[PDB]
Amino acid sequence: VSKSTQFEEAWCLVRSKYNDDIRKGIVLLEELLPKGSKEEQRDYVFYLAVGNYRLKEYEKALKYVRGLLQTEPQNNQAKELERLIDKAMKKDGLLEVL
Amino acid sequence: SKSTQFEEAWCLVRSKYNDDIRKGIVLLEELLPKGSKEEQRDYVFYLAVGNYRLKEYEKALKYVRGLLQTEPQNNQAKELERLIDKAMKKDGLLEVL
């Protein structure tokens, strides 16, 4: 039932090797998001970006991390994650058309 | 701006067209992190409404139940929950709204 239980569970799933676990972790984070404080929602949003990045949902991950940067332009984790997204995207495009 | 995106999402989620409702859902979900608390109230309610109308019952239920956690006496939310519960039992024509 608990909110910490869901977030701790989702933290593990988003860190997981298996894509099914990452998807479920995102599903938990999406449900937690409307229930969080403004600061928790910032954390939730960063972890939603990470999860979608690992699932190769690069456009969704980029949308989450761009939103974080609208309001926190000095956030270095978000800048770094955006850099990583850009780089995976460029390599994935190459793979598509080879 | 936030107000005009919500004004567009408000129209979309109430539209007669399924395409519109989908896009309204997209827009409310982006607004969700950006809103004050008395703003997220409306965002969460209209996400539940939109998902309900597209027969995304599990999503709609998650949204309204969270709203009922914060506002146990909210009779519009409770009514929308009653509607979701009923649509989940058998595929049919969703009630007027």
Author numbering:
A (entry chain B): 30 to 127
B (entry chain A): 31 to 127
What does the paper say about this structure?
A tetratricopeptide repeat (TPR) motif containing mitochondrial outer membrane protein, mitochondrial fission protein 1 (Fis1), mediates mitochondrial fission by recruiting large cytosolic GTPase, Drp1, to the mitochondrial outer membrane. The cytosolic domain of Fis1 is composed of 6 tight α-helices with two anti-parallel TPR motifs forming a concave hydrophobic surface. Fis1 interaction with Drp1 occurs during cellular stress, but not under physiological conditions, suggesting that cellular signals during stress activate Fis1. Human Fis1 protein contains a single cysteine, Cys41, in the entire protein.
To explore this possibility further, we crystallized and determined the X-ray structures of the WT and three phosphorylation mimic-mutants of Fis1: Thr34Asp Fis1, Thr34Glu Fis1 and Tyr38Glu Fis1. Each of these mutants was previously shown to be sufficient to increase Drp1 recruitment to mitochondria and subsequent mitochondrial fission in cell-based studies. Consistently, we observed that the first 30 residues including the α1 helix were missing from the structure providing strong evidence that the α1 helix undergoes significant conformational change and is potentially disordered in the phosphorylated forms, whereas it was intact in the WT. In one of the instances, Tyr38Glu Fis1 mutant was crystallized in an intermediate state, where the α1-helix was still intact, but was shifted away from the rest of the protein, as compared to the WT. We crystallized the phosphorylation-mimic mutants, Thr34Asp, Thr34Glu and Tyr38Glu Fis1, and we observed that in all the cases, these mutants crystallized as covalent dimers mediated by Cys41 disulfide bridge between two Fis1 protomers. As Thr34Asp, Thr34Glu and Tyr38Glu Fis1 have a greater propensity for a conformationally altered N-terminus and hence have more exposed Cys41, they crystallized as covalent dimers. Upon closer examination of the crystal structures, we observed that the concave hydrophobic surface in the covalent dimers of all the phosphorylation-mimic mutants was exposed. Here we showed that Cys41 is also oxidizable and mediates Fis1 covalent dimerization through disulfide linkage. This oxidation-induced Fis1 dimerization was obvious in the crystal structures of Thr34Asp, Thr34Glu and Tyr38Glu Fis1, where we saw a clear electron density for the disulfide linkage.
